Design a protein around this ligand. Structure first.
Ligand SMILES: [Zn+2]
Lengths: 242, 66, 384, 166, 55, 121, 90, 167
């Protein structure tokens, strides 16, 4: 765990994620702009074959990244490839959007979308250091207000804590998401309904997706890292839900 | 008037117990109450929650040691 | 290949109604919008494009007995023809209610959602239709009344005798001609410019429905309870231009395709037939275990689909030909398709072609009722 | 009746003329969605007519900001003035298909003879155009669309946050 | 003595049931306590502890 | 101050300071800007109450960043002296944090006031 | 490839048999056949943890087996358990 | 492989010898408790349940309130609605009964009309619904599923089985 221990990198089942084996395992993604940490994480550094070149890696913290939690708990199909354009609704900061950039690689893009202003500023700085991220500080309920900037994304990720989550996702996925396209919702029942419990909230939102033409492929409840969160992986079908 | 009289009496008794909150003054929430609410209004749970005791069993012991 | 690719059923309109669809009124102007009315009292304004609703007005206490969609011509202002549509519901408890619908057709604006106006009545209203281009609607209760939109009292009374009236319909071209079906099994043509009844014909059994045709202006078909659809001329009413014969129960509704050549008939038996005007026999029959007592049928407005409201509370829309897919097709495939259609038309009457083209699967109750009806007709024929 | 449709782009505006309509009763169907997805079946529906590019990046930024706020720009007004046929201002208006209900009324105010449409059908057409992109431009020159996306996104975001060299 | 005092027996049975529940499924406890030590028990690649929606 | 955007009205301040006082009596409350920042980084904070007349405003304006980054509700009250009296310490506190605990007697009031703050946001 | 081969092979053997290195850890059960491609690398701490997870310089040894046997509590545990199992063998 | 060769090899055999997917257990379940079932309940309706309710004259919403002493939202899937519609003309009353402003319908994405598989999959995936039925095969499958209340129709009103707080 310390700042000197040597570890062995290995490819994960998902293309673009790595496991750092040692006395305790870590989850790792290849850094794009090496030399720096966007939120103070311990970064692994290897060397590769001219004098050799240092390739830096980074460590996902599952108690921060709700996508790390989903990888680490174990998801079948994470819709983010090493070459795909992903949409990120609610990219509050680098603490997850930088890692999604690192896993889509230098070819694909990632349209970080945020509403407020202060993390908008820190996201501006982080996305100036990264090439793949383009940051949008338009509200996430107004796809027509930021429609000039995004073209036909491949899968959307959703971390908005708003209670109109299904409506926000339906709008953005209808206007921007490709057909047969991945959707990854991160549901938080304490922000949807404090009154009725988690399984009711999850079944309700899954049925809302099923109504709004997203066939839900699977569902995980990332327990030991975050109390009461679900992530639904779905596929935008657009024609013939059957 | 039977419904009004008995329902208002039942609601105010539950509100005084504390099981039914102020803003839920309706017979539907009276239908939706439960055993966890009542066992949370017991006294040993209140002593443990207010913090005169380290555990629920310690609260029980304190109460019955007077 | 046609018999293998025949797939008539395309979908249904949402969850539908509760207690059976008894009134359907398509929008003659636009293409997506229709209005359906249940016997429970609730009327709905379906967008067929997304197969969903716009609003849902719990309207009356009694059944709805007629629906119409329109645009009124108010004198106080010009109402928006574009951001709103209007519906006209004709109730059982002596009321005619005129409603707005906010419609997202055009986006050139940005209140007044429901119940623009109410017309109280004296008798139970039973049918309704709207004189087009002038916004003047006639309602058939125990005696038909011509109402203006801007007058709460009925403007004029039209009545041959003191017998009730079941249904009405205006003609499409030469729009001052009305026709009416009354429950002394009688068809009465009414006229507007002379403001009077015009001619009465007394048939044998009661005509459940009538429909003018939109491409000849003086032909109309009557859905008649003796399993028949009678195609009448207007001027020579002493005979009928044609008979359409292939039902086994009471025909409930008829409609003309807007091309003016095909007639779709829904019956009290749980089946819906499509006829051509020239033949006088069923070109095709549509049927399902899930549909019952089809009480209304409306051919669509672009002449491609057939909406059919049954009384199980579902409004199922079908294809008018079981092959013409909605996708735009390349020139090679379109030429091959028209070639195969023309060739089948030329060789239609060969015995093998006729066998495989007419072999359509019919439910066993309709099959057995048809053969029993044939035995009864043959026995009557040999006695004559 | 969907006669023309507009499309905003980071390198300027494009105005297309619709040739054949997909029928609006079976618009929810597998076959019509698949012929939207296939490119060779889209050009039977949509051909380009005009494409006016922005002058510079600052003009692109200001025009994107005006589209975001939902108003009409000078270049947009010029493009529609050149492209749309002037019909009678009382009946038989010319139908333009756009993507924003908020953009609707400003277009209508600036041109009384035009009528905006943002339906499910118009959103489907704009979705197909956005999917096929540079293949619909018949060889007309444009910038790298993705580079234009990145530049305009950063400029628009820095404008909305008010980033500072201080 | 667990048969002697009845509430001591329920107490001990409850804490034993808590340990066994934590063995059955991954429960929530606290959060991260210090810095990220790493997944102390190991990452497994091919397990997929997710609920697959069937059709 | 527009930088103090969510500023509570009178009745909202009264409710918030009553909940702070009960939470201090139960000792579910962490007082001070550095202690509130530590609770936020720990992820154990229920919600955040800040002062508005703090001299100057930036030394606690650093907090909304972490607040919505971890998606915590926050609010501004006018008087840091009122906040200190409600916390029950002899000095004016400019930023206090109600922590999370569900073995707590004031869970219902905490959830009510947190919901009302979230609605104000 | 086939240089640094002995020490890399020893470290891979260690990580494969890591369930026995410490009598308090008890990892999950996996087989872990040696992967196709890997790259041994070091962990860089942040300047924000000079006390907590900064390691040292005179303990930073170039091999995980080297620093493991450089640790001492593991050494006494290993000689204890090894004497136990050796006596049980003989 | 002859039969004698088979016997010989069997005798010599005797003489000589002498990714995956494990679905997580839901976070709603203390060992069999299913602590995510608190009133108001959500109850999945089945076709046989509707028909036996019609036969024994118990109302759905009000008879269910009489059973559970709490408000219950009954939910009908598209598979169940299609089974009603295919049963058809003799069960017209059951169809008009299930078509109601309080019966909140919930959609599905299935190729087929197997209501049993639809309900079994629903309950496997969520464990917040209680199932309402009278069918023996579905009863046995759901009883093997752990921590899911079953509610059959029988006698004079409904009966509930796997709920702890029946009273
Ligand atoms: Zn289903």
């Amino acid at each position: 765990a310390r700042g000197g221990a040597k570890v062995v990198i290995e490819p994960h089942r998902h293309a673009g994620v790595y496991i750092a084996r040692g006395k305790e395992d870590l989850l790792v993604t290849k850094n794009m702009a090496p030399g720096e940490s966007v939120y103070g994480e311990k970064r692994i550094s290897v060397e590769e074959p001219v004098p050799p070149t240092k390739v830096e890696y980074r460590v996902w913290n599952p108690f921060r990244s709700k996508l790390a939690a989903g990888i680490m708990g174990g998801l079948d199909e994470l819709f983010i490839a090493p070459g795909k354009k992903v949409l990120y609704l609610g990219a509050a900061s680098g603490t997850s959007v930088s890692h999604v950039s690192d896993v889509v690689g230098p070819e694909g893009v990632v349209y970080a979308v945020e509403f407020s202003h202060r993390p908008g500023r820190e996201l501006i700085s982080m996305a100036k250091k990264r090439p793949n991220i383009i940051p949008i500080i338009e509200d996430a309920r107004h796809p027509q207000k930021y429609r000039m900037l995004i073209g036909m994304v491949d899968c959307v990720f959703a971390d908005v804590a708003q209670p109109d989550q299904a409506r926000i996702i339906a709008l953005n996925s209808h206007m921007f998401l490709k057909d047969q396209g991945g959707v990854v919702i991160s549901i938080k029942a304490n922000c949807i309904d404090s009154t009725v419990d988690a399984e009711t909230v999850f079944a309700r939102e899954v049925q809302k997706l099923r109504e709004e033409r997203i066939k839900p492929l699977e569902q995980l409840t990332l327990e030991p890292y975050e109390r009461d969160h679900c992530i639904v992986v779905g596929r935008y079908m657009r024609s013939g839900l059957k | 008037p039977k419904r009004l009289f008995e329902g208002n009496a039942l609601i105010r008794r539950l509100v005084r117990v504390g099981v039914l909150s102020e803003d839920k003054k309706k017979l539907d929430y009276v239908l939706a109450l439960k055993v966890e609410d009542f066992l949370e209004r017991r006294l040993q749970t209140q002593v443990y929650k207010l913090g005169l005791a380290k555990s629920v069993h310690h609260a029980r012991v304190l109460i019955t040691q007077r | 290949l046609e018999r293998m690719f025949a797939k008539p059923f395309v979908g249904q309109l949402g969850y539908g109604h509760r207690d059976g669809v008894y009134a359907i009124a398509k929008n003659y102007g636009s293409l997506n919008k229709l209005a359906t009315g249940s016997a429970d009292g609730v009327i709905k304004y379906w967008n067929m494009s997304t197969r969903e609703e716009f609003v849902s007005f719990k309207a009356h206490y009694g059944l709805v007995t007629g629906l119409c969609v329109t645009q009124p011509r108010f004198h106080d202002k010009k109402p928006d023809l574009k951001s709103q549509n209007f519906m006209l519901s004709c109730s059982d408890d002596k009321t005619v209610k005129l409603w707005s619908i906010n419609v997202d057709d055009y986006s050139n604006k940005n209140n007044e959602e429901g119940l623009i106006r109410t017309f109280d009545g004296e008798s139970a209203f039973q049918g309704i239709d709207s004189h087009r281009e002038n916004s003047t609607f006639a309602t058939g209760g125990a005696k038909i009344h011509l109402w203006d939109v801007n007058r709460l009292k009925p403007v004029s009374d039209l009545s041959w005798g003191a017998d009730n009236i079941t249904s009405l319909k205006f003609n499409q071209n030469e729009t001052d001609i009305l026709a009416s079906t009354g429950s002394d099994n009688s068809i009465v043509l009414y006229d507007l410019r002379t403001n009077s009844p015009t001619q009465k014909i007394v048939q044998t059994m009661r005509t459940n429905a009538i429909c003018w045709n939109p491409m000849e202006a003086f032909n109309f078909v009557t859905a008649n309870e003796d399993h028949n659809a009678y195609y009448y001329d207007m001027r020579n009413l002493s005979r009928s231009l044609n008979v359409f014969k292939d039902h086994v129960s009471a025909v409930m509704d008829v409609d003309f395709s807007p091309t003016g050549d095909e007639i779709v008939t829904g019956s009290y038996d749980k089946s819906i037939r499509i006829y051509k005007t020239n033949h006088g026999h069923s070109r095709e029959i549509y049927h399902t275990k899930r549909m019952q007592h089809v009480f209304q049928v409306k051919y669509s407005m672009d002449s491609k689909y057939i909406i059919s409201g049954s009384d199980d509370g579902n409004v199922r829309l079908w294809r008018s030909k079981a092959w013409e897919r909605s996708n735009v097709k390349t020139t090679r495939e379109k030429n091959k398709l028209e070639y195969d259609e023309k060739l089948k038309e030329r060789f239609r009457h060969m015995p093998e072609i006729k066998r495989i083209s007419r072999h359509r699967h019919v439910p066993q109750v309709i099959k057995k009722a048809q053969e029993i009806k044939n035995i009864e007709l043959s026995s009557i024929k040999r006695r004559e | 009746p969907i006669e023309y449709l507009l499309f905003e782009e980071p390198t300027g505006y494009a105005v297309f003329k619709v040739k054949l309509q997909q029928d609006d009763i079976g618009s929810r169907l597998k076959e019509v969605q698949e012929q939207i997805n296939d490119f060779g079946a889209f050009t039977k529906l949509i051909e380009l007519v005009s494409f006016a590019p922005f002058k510079g990046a600052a003009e692109a930024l200001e025009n994107a900001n005006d589209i975001s706020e939902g108003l009409v720009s000078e270049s947009l007004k010029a493009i529609l003035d050149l492209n749309l046929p002037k019909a009678s201002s009382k009946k038989k208006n010319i139908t333009l298909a756009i993507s924003d209900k908020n953009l609707g009324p400003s277009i209508k105010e600036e041109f009384p003879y035009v009528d905006c449409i943002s339906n499910e059908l118009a959103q489907d057409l704009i979705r197909g155009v956005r999917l096929h992109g540079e293949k619909l431009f018949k060889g007309l020159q444009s910038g790298d669309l993705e580079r234009a996306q990145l530049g305009l996104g950063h400029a628009y975001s820095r404008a909305k946050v008010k980033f500072s060299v201080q | 003595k667990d048969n002697r005092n009845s509430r001591v027996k329920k107490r001990k049975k409850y804490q034993k049931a808590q340990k066994k529940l934590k063995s059955v499924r991954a429960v929530y406890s606290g959060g991260q306590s210090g810095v990220y030590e790493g997944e102390k028990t190991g990452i497994k690649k091919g397990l997929t502890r997710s609920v697959k929606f069937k059709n | 101050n527009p930088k103090a955007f969510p500023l509570a009205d009178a009745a909202l301040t009264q409710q918030i300071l009553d909940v702070v006082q009960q939470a201090a009596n139960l000792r579910q409350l962490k007082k001070g800007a550095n202690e509130a920042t530590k609770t936020l980084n720990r992820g154990i904070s229920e919600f955040i109450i800040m002062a508005a007349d703090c001299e100057p405003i930036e030394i606690l304006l650093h907090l909304p960043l972490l607040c919505e980054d971890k998606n915590v509700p926050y609010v501004f009250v006018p008087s840091r002296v009122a906040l200190g009296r409600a916390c029950g310490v002899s000095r004016p506190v400019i930023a206090a944090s109600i922590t999370t605990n569900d073995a707590s007697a004031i869970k219902t009031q905490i959830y009510a006031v947190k919901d009302k703050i979230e609605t104000l946001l | 490839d086939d240089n640094m081969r002995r020490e890399v092979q020893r470290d891979l053997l260690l990580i494969k048999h890591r369930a026995a290195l410490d009598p308090k850890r008890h990892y999950k059960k996996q087989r872990w056949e040696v992967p196709e491609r890997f790259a041994i690398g070091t962990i860089i701490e942040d300047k924000s943890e000079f006390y907590s997870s900064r390691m040292n310089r005179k303990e930073r040894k170039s091999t995980i087996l080297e620093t493991l046997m450089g640790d001492e509590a593991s050494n006494k545990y290993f000689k204890r358990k090894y004497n136990e199992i050796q006596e049980k063998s003989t | 492989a002859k039969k004698t060769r088979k016997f010989g090899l069997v005798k010599r055999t005797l003489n000589t010898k002498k990714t995956r997917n494990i679905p997580q257990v839901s976070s709603a379940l203390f060992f069999q408790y299913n602590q995510a079932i608190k009133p108001p309940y959500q109850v999945l309706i089945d076709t046989n349940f509707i028909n036996f309710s019609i036969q024994k004259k118990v109302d759905i919403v009000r008879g269910m309130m009489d059973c559970l002493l709490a408000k219950c939202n009954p939910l009908i899937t598209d598979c169940v609605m299609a089974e009603l519609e295919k049963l058809g003309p003799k069960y017209r009353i059951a169809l008009k009964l299930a078509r109601d402003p309080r019966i909140k319908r919930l959609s599905c994405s299935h190729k087929g009309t197997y209501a049993d598989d639809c309900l079994v999959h629903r309950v496997l995936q969520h464990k917040c619904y209680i199932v309402a039925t009278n069918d023996a095969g579905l009863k046995q499958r759901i009883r093997k599923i752990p921590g899911i209340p079953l509610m059959s129709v029988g006698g004079h009103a409904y009966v509930i089985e796997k709920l702890p707080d029946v009273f």
